[PDB]
Amino acid sequence: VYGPVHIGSGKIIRKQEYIYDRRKSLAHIVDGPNLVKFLNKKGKFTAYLQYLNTTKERADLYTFLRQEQIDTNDWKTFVLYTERVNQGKGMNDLHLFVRDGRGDLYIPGSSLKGALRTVLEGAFHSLSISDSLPIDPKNLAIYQKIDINKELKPMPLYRECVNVFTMKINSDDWTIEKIEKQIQQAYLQYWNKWFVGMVTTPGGKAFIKGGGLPSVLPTVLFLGGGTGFPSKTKPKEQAQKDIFAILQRRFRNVYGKMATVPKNVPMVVNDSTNKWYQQGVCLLEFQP
Amino acid sequence: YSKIRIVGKIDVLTGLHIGGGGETSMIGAIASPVVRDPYSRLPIIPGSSIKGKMRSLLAKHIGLIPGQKMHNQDAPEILRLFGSSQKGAIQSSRLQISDAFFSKASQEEFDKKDLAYTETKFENTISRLTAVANPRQIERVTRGASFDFHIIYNVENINEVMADFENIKTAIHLLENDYLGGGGTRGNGRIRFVIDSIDTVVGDFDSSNL
Amino acid sequence: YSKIRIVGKIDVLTGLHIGGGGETSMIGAIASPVVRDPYSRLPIIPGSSIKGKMRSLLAKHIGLIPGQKMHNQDAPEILRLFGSSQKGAIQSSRLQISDAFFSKASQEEFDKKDLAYTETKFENTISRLTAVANPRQIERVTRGASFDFHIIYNVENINEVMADFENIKTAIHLLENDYLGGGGTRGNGRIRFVIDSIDTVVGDFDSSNL
Amino acid sequence: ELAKMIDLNFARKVVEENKRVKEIVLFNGLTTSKLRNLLELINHVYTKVYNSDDTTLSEDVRDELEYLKVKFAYESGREPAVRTFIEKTYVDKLVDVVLKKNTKKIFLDYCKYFEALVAYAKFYR
Amino acid sequence: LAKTKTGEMIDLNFARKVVEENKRVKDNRGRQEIVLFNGLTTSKLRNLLELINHVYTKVYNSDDTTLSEDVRDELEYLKVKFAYESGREPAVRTFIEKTYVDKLVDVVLKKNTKKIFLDYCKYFEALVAYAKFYR
RNA sequence: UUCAGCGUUCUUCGGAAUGUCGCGCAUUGGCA
């Protein structure tokens, strides 16, 4: 996991749903009911409602708590847990990581299997992949999605990502050497056909200047989300033409209006450490 | 004529999905729910599922005759252990695997931990020609839950009872290495067996060796 | 000559599939419906299934004469208890096992919790050749079902009454291990004859020590 | 004898007209899976209707039938082929008249009509 | 489920009527695109439906016929979230005020019954499905 | 520069039971 990886759980929580300490630089992920009943008991529920009515757009919970000056230990009692944060801008949005019924951090094996199937294509019953081992929640830190299209820009999409598996095959259908060779070939194709376009852009120059890409980057996979359209899907020029056509067909606003073929289709992460990072990249190891 | 009863534990290593239709699903809720005991309203590993999975794994292990268009034609050890239906060669079924119900121990563990025995897993199908995703919600059984599986073996051929129980143990190991229920090729259905006790409920057979 | 009733109950421990017929399957409905008494439209356990299972298990325990082609070749205890039809030497059956109906207690506990009496279990058939499933719907009976089994014993030879009731006890113990109805090899049929009440309905026979 | 006539012969003839061969395509490209899902909902309500013995539809089955109409509308919105099928066979209108009648018999003939639609749709392929 | 003003009842056909009433063709640049609830899209609708989905799953797993205190606090948080979302976007505000969902959650809280919450969930299903249908 | 996210999909496609027994025997009958 050389880059922050977020596997969504279908739940997106707003700024007002959780607390964000800017000075302490930590995000308190809180459940709803505990906070609601705490405010009902302490008389802060009507105050919270008036706060929501006063400022519709920005309703950060931490600023409201500071305005009411509530005790920090009274904050901890309704907080589900806390996470270390990284922002390039209070946070706007937040995407939660996938948690099973018990609540441990884990990457589902289905994500790995789907990524492997996509990269290998170019059936699939023999390759049986199971869930990865549980990970302690402290590795779950909140990162930001940043778009680099000739210029870097922070985005409101903040995502809970992991900080930077048992599998069985049948010998005839799949082989470890063949699948790893195909993974490496797919990564090389991704580098040659699309990564060079981002290298040439000035935003890419800024990214490499700060050492954003790992020096080492073998077997590299795009496990989680935020990786891009070059993944999750040919001659180079024909491929670019197909992506441009499909983007024009689907996204009427950004791509449909503009007729000219961009420099690279598609046109497009900050951490408290000076090194820049990219979302979704992972390094894998297979043992028999 | 002695009946030897196996009782043991099936502890879910990962989430367990065993689908079942006929349930109205809310929009955006679980599209494909797991099987439930209607009484307890709790997840259950049906005896049919366990028996079918074990027979399939064993018949794949020893071998499958080419052009095997039916289950009756198979390795005769499987016919003796699980049954057969061939015209003129019906063999009685010596293994009767029953439903694996939710144990009180794991249920109380979850109740004390404030956990629901099921979980809703978010997945999506990403068509890659257009990179268009179609989402879905699958129900799974929370890891750490335990079921109590209860098989009964009729001792008809005393000479080969040791071989038959060895085959049962081998099939159990095969079920260990593989999954049970829905798509386990993507990470579901992992289970673990803990053999609690083997005894002879009815008859005069000796169960100490087994 | 006395008549003794053994009215009690049967606690199903898993699904119970005693199939039936005479009704065409509506497309997508249950492929194999459970037998129901038409007036009450409730699943029942026909006395024929109980008597057949008891007789088969007891005959297996006592021992079958090699090359037994007819039921009338069983051991004389089995013929004495369950009845025989030979040529000229016909033995009347002292056991009369009636249809076991859905209990009113179980009916009330299923009307509570808003639970259907039967469960449309959803099954498939993975072929050995093409590995393609084949959906099936089986109308099993839920776990909470209790059935009012009713058995009449006729005392003809007072000396053999005790041995006959030991045979009945052995057979019901065998049935507590063995299943009732179809699909028992795949989880169905498990039962337990927990509830009993034996008394002499007609005559002067002593039924306290039975 | 639901409305206007609507019978099993209507089902067979409407599946015949809406059938077009290029491969066989019915109702402007309705796959059998969508029809099977609709029939699965039909089975889910029909089992509850069959188990009850009274001749008058209860409130629970009436609410489930309103839910079934809503699901029909959702399915039509999801795919144009299902919308054209629902409009050509008027299944939702039959649901409405079944609600209006408040009789188990009308629901039973509605289920028979739906099953006939499924059978003839598969047969003509 | 409940009752609105002017004697109109709350039902799934009422959801159909509500979505139809707030439907304007609103042709622009010669293209006929359907708008619902004065600019409301289906993404906000799916977000609200997921918010309902969580509590629906929690109530569906439980066998209790009376709404648990945990589900009551779920519903209070639902009210807070609905108010926040309606304040955020005017289109969502018109949607919420026209469908009377914010009153309906209060009714289901007062009734304190699992069946009533299920009926309210069915009503929200009717809203979202019928909005998808008319589009 | 600041602020804010937004829309997209919500399951899909197939498999919807199959094969087998289809009353048998005994008495009545036919033969003798």
Tab-separated table of N, CA and C (backbone and C1' of nucleotides) in Angstrom, chain A residues 14-15 89 92, chain F residues 4-7:
chain	number	residue	atom	x	y	z
A	14	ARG	N	-21.246	14.061	6.166
A	14	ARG	CA	-21.036	15.469	5.874
A	14	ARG	C	-20.089	16.097	6.893
A	15	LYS	N	-19.818	17.391	6.710
A	15	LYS	CA	-18.991	18.114	7.668
A	15	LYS	C	-19.665	18.195	9.031
A	89	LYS	N	-6.433	22.373	2.183
A	89	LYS	CA	-7.166	23.631	2.144
A	89	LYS	C	-6.490	24.686	3.014
A	92	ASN	N	-14.673	19.549	4.153
A	92	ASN	CA	-16.010	19.592	3.573
A	92	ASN	C	-16.727	18.251	3.709
F	4	A	P	-16.744	25.387	3.054
F	4	A	O5'	-17.492	24.694	1.803
F	4	A	C5'	-18.920	24.893	1.664
F	4	A	C4'	-19.372	24.433	0.301
F	4	A	C3'	-19.134	22.959	-0.038
F	4	A	O3'	-20.128	22.103	0.509
F	4	A	C1'	-18.518	24.329	-1.872
F	5	G	P	-19.727	20.856	1.439
F	5	G	O5'	-18.806	19.885	0.530
F	5	G	C5'	-19.444	18.921	-0.350
F	5	G	C4'	-19.804	19.595	-1.650
F	5	G	C3'	-20.734	18.824	-2.591
F	5	G	O3'	-22.102	19.053	-2.275
F	5	G	C1'	-18.871	19.660	-3.802
F	6	C	P	-23.247	18.019	-2.727
F	6	C	O5'	-23.198	17.959	-4.334
F	6	C	C5'	-23.670	19.092	-5.098
F	6	C	C4'	-23.447	18.802	-6.560
F	6	C	C3'	-24.037	17.479	-7.053
F	6	C	O3'	-25.432	17.611	-7.287
F	6	C	C1'	-21.835	17.780	-7.913
F	7	G	P	-26.408	16.352	-7.093
F	7	G	O5'	-26.111	15.466	-8.408
F	7	G	C5'	-26.594	15.952	-9.684
F	7	G	C4'	-25.900	15.215	-10.803
F	7	G	C3'	-26.109	13.699	-10.852
F	7	G	O3'	-27.318	13.366	-11.525
F	7	G	C1'	-23.805	14.221	-11.136
